[PDB]
């Protein structure tokens, strides 16, 4: 009879995971360092 299923196989992995990745936390510290050396130069 015309009745058959199917199964899928996934080609899914791309740009790193959502912001649970370390990109944002990494970005955080640079601004603090900028503040520090701005102080020193002034």
């Amino acid at each position: 009879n015309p009745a058959i299923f199917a199964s899928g196989i996934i080609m899914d992995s791309s740009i790193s995971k959502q912001a649970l990745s370390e990109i944002e936390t990494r970005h955080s510290e640079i601004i603090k360092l900028e503040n520090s050396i701005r102080e020193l130069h002034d």
């Binding site: 299923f5 199964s7 899928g8 196989i9 996934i10």
Partner: protein, 529 residues
């Protein structure tokens, strides 16, 4: 705090005792002695039976009794998934905690229960569809490898419930994986009594049950009622009793002050039995009223003889031990009224399971279907302590036609093989068959299978005809005397089923023309003895 009476299961003492002995006997005896024996523990139970007998209730109650972790549950095929390799991890996720605790706490660990529900949906025989459907060959392998593999577990217990014990894989039922196998069947009188007491205790506690209701009569009356149908009966009786106090359901719902004086009387039980609940392996009064359409009347000597010969056969099949299977063939000329006599004999047998296999319900069926339906009716009869199965119009069942001749061979072989298959040890069976042509059955070598034969005659004398007319009483005194004067000095040859139609046809003329028309018809029919 466990106590058996709190369980609330009735009629299953032997099964529970066996399960307790085989499964939980070695986890309660003092450990020091059990160590000196070096015996492992049982890790499986299987339950099977027909619908509505008390499997899931037993599983739930066993789950509640153990002071251990909360049981896991799997509702049917809850584990399947659409991504390759994701329908197996769900199998492995069930044993992880048990594995970890066995690794950590050694031999003092707890007990982890698992309950597979409808296990015949994911554990069918391997290699049955050219490697199965692709996802029913990996799941089975994973389950087999996990239950008993290279690494040893000693703190699990798996339970299974299924209606079809034939399709489960064979490698999964050996004495190392699912050792205990139990069949849950219908109860006998004591079981019904226990079930009714269990389900009526609460009502009797608060004096909501009348005093004219006697449980023993109800137990005797309900023959071959499954477990759930007794509960259904009680519920229907309660609902019918409660419906009295809602007066204006049509307009607006209102409840009276007499709700306090609420009581359930036997009339509700009788009404519920008559109208609402209908069993599955029992019997009901519609079929008899459909076959015996005009009762039975004693118009002569032969009827009593036939009934006596039926009674003797019934008594023999009830008492004897050497012969658990007996059969008899009722035969006679057409329009003689033989199926009614067979129905009467079966009804007066008073056996629990009585079913009629008639061609009225096989219109348009091919041979394969007739054969399979016959097999099912004859299989249902192997699951009762007593039975009686009636076969009707053996001629029409074979599709026999005088030309050629032409008929079906597969059905005939099925019948010839099915009259010599003894039931499972300890049960009895009686088969009655009816036919209108003995010689044709003789030519097929089919009178050797039957054990005994009975003959059914016609009306063959004027006095018997007069007695039949008097019993029916359609013609009054004067017309009866005229008929007697006409026919008393001759011989007649007519059947009862034809006599009724002749009378009905004759009655439609004018009031003064009935007797002559009836005599004309009776002359026209012809004798040819």
């Amino acid at each position: 705090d466990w106590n058996f009476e709190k369980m609330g299961i009735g009629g299953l003492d032997k099964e529970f005792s066996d399960i307790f002995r085989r499964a939980f006997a070695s986890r309660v005896f003092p450990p020091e002695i059990v160590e000196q024996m070096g015996c492992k523990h049982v890790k499986g139970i299987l339950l099977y039976g027909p619908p509505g007998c008390g499997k899931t209730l037993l599983a739930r109650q066993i789950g509640k009794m153990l002071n251990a972790r909360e049981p896991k549950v799997v509702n049917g095929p809850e584990i399947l998934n659409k991504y390759v390799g994701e329908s197996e991890a769900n199998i492995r996720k069930l044993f992880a905690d048990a594995e970890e605790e066995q690794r950590r706490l050694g031999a003092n660990s707890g007990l982890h229960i698992i309950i597979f529900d409808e296990i015949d949906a994911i554990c069918k025989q391997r290699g049955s569809m050219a490697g199965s459907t692709g996802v029913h060959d990996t799941v089975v392998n994973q389950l087999l490898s996990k239950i008993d593999g290279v690494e040893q577990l000693n703190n699990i217990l798996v339970i299974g419930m299924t209606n079809r014990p034939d399709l489960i894989d064979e490698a999964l039922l050996r004495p190392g994986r699912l050792e205990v196998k139990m069949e849950i069947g219908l109860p006998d009188e004591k079981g019904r009594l226990q079930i009714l007491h269990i389900h009526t205790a609460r009502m009797r506690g608060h004096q909501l049950l009348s005093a004219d209701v006697d449980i023993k009569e109800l137990a005797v009356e309900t023959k071959n009622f499954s477990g759930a149908e007794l509960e259904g009966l009680v519920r229907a009786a309660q609902s019918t009793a409660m419906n009295r106090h809602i007066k204006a359901s049509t307009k607006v719902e209102v409840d009276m002050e007499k709700a306090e004086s609420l009581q359930v009387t036997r009339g509700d039980f009788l009404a519920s039995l008559e109208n609402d609940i209908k069993p599955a392996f029992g019997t009901n009064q519609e079929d008899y009223a459909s076959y015996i359409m005009n009762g039975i009347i004693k118009w002569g000597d032969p009827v009593t003889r036939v009934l006596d010969d039926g009674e003797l056969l019934v008594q023999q099949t009830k008492n004897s031990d050497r012969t658990p299977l007996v059969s008899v063939l009722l035969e006679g000329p057409p329009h003689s009224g033989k199926t009614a006599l067979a129905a009467k004999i079966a009804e007066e047998s008073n056996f629990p399971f009585i079913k009629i296999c008639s061609p009225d319900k096989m219109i348009g069926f091919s041979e394969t279907a007739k054969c399979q339906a016959m097999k099912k009716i004859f299989d249902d009869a192997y699951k009762s302590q007593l039975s009686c199965v009636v076969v009707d119009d053996i001629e029409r069942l074979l599709d026999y036609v005088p030309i050629g001749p032409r008929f079906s061979n597969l059905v005939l072989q099925a019948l010839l093989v099915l009259l010599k298959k003894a039931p499972p040890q300890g049960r009895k069976l009686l088969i009655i068959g009816t036919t209108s042509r003995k010689d044709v059955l003789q030519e097929m070598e089919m009178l050797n299978a039957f054990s005994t034969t009975i003959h059914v005659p016609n009306i063959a004398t004027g006095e018997q005809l007069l007695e039949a007319l008097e019993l029916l009483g359609n013609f009054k005194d004067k017309e009866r005397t005229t008929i007697a004067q006409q026919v008393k000095g001759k011989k007649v040859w007519i059947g009862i089923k034809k006599l009724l139609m002749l009378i009905e046809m004759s009655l439609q003329m004018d009031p003064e023309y009935r007797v002559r028309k009836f005599l004309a018809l009776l002359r026209e029919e012809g004798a040819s003895p």
